[PDB]
Structure 1
Amino acid sequence: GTGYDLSNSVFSPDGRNFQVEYAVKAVENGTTSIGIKCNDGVVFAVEKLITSKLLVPQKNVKIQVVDRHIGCVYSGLIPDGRHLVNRGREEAASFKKLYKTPIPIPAFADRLGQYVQAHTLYNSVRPFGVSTIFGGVDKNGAHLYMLEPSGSYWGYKGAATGKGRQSAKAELEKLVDHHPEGLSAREAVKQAAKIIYLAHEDNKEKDFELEISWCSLSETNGLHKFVKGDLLQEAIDFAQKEIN
């Protein structure tokens, strides 16, 4: 027949859920954002699109942190991931409440993928319109994960989502080749900044703001934290030079 898409849990005649696939639509539409696992740790980079001067700088913050070691960022409908994020914040809490440890990134990774996939399991459950790049330093190093409304996430040497991901995925692939060694968080900070501007070239039509956060076994000790001030401004001009 037809209209298989018209209800979530339905399998398409080819066995697919177009709703999720449609949810994927706005995901791309979601603000381009990336993440990087550097040598010790991970870095989370996202463009903050400036809609207007009435927006107050730095105030509306995209990247969200789970526990204290896990940052998360997503292209898509903000309230979605937020809603999800809270659940993750719940998850780790329960996890840590039970396990006394902060949660391993992959552990944390898994739990969500279920909860997302749960929203693939019912025609009444609206899949998620977001894909979160997320991770942090954990017991064993860091990890870099981006979870799809499909309920699929993976380990990522680098990760990107939203519009400009291609420009990103380009640059990420490069740095992989530029630095199969690894990367210093600092350069991880710096390079992402360039990538973002480059990624912004798709959305170049409007001005934006740049938000980048990171989790460094070294620099944040394994905490997850924002890039701020000079170091933030550094990568900016570092990129703002390199963009030219």
Structure 2
Amino acid sequence: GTGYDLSNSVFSPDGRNFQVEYAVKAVENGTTSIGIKCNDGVVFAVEKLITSKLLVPQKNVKIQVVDRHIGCVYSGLIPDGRHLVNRGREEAASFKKLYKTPIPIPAFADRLGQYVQAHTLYNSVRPFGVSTIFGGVDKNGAHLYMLEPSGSYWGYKGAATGKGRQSAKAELEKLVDHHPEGLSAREAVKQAAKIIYLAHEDNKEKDFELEISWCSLSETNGLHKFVKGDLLQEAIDFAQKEIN
């Protein structure tokens, strides 16, 4: 028959949920965001399209902090990403309250995944429209995860989602091949700036602003912090050199 793509949680004769795939398309329509796991932490980066010079630069932050050690950046429908980040913050607060210890990165990943999978379980709720790359440093070291609107989430050496996800994935594969020992935190920041600058060329019609955060056991003592000032400009210059 027909009509399997009009209601959420409805399995097509193939075994698919078409509304989830449409949400994935909505994600693919979003900007490019990447995460890079280094030897002692993770680095998140995102492109912010400067639709007009009326936008206040360095403001309109896109990377959200969870607890004090988790970083999250979502590609797709930004409001849905904020909803998911708020839910994750509530989950982290609950975990810390009950077990005192801060929530581990895998636990947080599974919480977000179960939330999204529940959102893919009823025809009364729309699937999420954001792919979220998140992670941080816990007692077991660095962790980088990516979660899709289907509720599927995995741990990554490097992850990327958005319009320029393919070029970013190729550059991340190059980085993984050329660095088996692992990247350093600042090297990961420079590579994230480079990959963001390289993926902007797909939509070079309008100028963009780079936003980078990192959580490193040595560089930030395990806390999620926004890369700003001298390091951000250094990464921007590194990328500008790398393009040409």
Q: Classify the TM-score, shorter chain.
A: over 0.9
Residue 14 of structure 2 is aligned to residue 2 of structure 1:
no
Task: Please give the TM-score of this superposition, normalised by the length of structure 1.
Answer: 0.99
Q: Distance in 2 between matches of 1:209 and 1:217?
A: 27
CA shift for structure 1 position 239: 0.8
CA shift for structure 1 position 34: 0.2
CA shift for structure 1 position 102: 1.1
RMSD: 0.7
SS in 2 for 1:81: helix
- Corresponding residue for residue 153 of structure 1: 153
SS in 1 for 2:5: helix
Q: Distance in 2 between matches of 1:202 and 1:97?
A: 45
Q: Distance in 2 between matches of 1:33 and 1:204?
A: 16
SS in 2 for 1:133: strand
CA shift for structure 1 position 48: 1.1
SS in 1 for 2:132: strand
CA shift for structure 1 position 236: 0.6
- Corresponding residue for residue 102 of structure 1: 102
Deviations 1:70-107 (A, max 9, x none): 00001010010100100100000000011111110000
CA shift for structure 1 position 178: 1.3
CA shift for structure 1 position 15: 1.0
CA shift for structure 1 position 170: 0.7
Deviations 1:110-150 (A, max 9, x none): 01100001111011210000000000011111110110011
Q: Distance in 2 between matches of 1:35 and 1:82?
A: 18
Deviations 1:202-234 (A, max 9, x none): 121211100000100111111011111111111
CA shift for structure 1 position 163: 0.6
Q: Distance in 1 between matches of 2:220 and 2:65?
A: 13
Unaligned runs of 5+ in 2: none
Q: Distance in 1 between matches of 2:64 and 2:234?
A: 22
Task: Please give the TM-score of this superposition, normalised by the length of structure 2.
Answer: 0.99
Q: Distance in 2 between matches of 1:235 and 1:243?
A: 12
Deviations 1:141-160 (A, max 9, x none): 11101100110111100000
CA shift for structure 1 position 201: 1.2
Deviations 1:177-207 (A, max 9, x none): 1111110111100011110011111121211
SS in 2 for 1:102: coil
Matches within 5 A, 1:82-161: 82-161=82-161
SS in 2 for 1:4: coil
How many residue pairs match? The answer is 244
Q: Distance in 2 between matches of 1:32 and 1:206?
A: 14
CA shift for structure 1 position 3: 1.1
SS in 1 for 2:225: strand
CA shift for structure 1 position 58: 1.2
Percent identical among aligned pairs is: 100
CA shift for structure 1 position 33: 0.7
Deviations 1:11-31 (A, max 9, x none): 011111010100000111111
Q: Distance in 2 between matches of 1:178 and 1:233?
A: 25
Unaligned runs of 5+ in 1: none
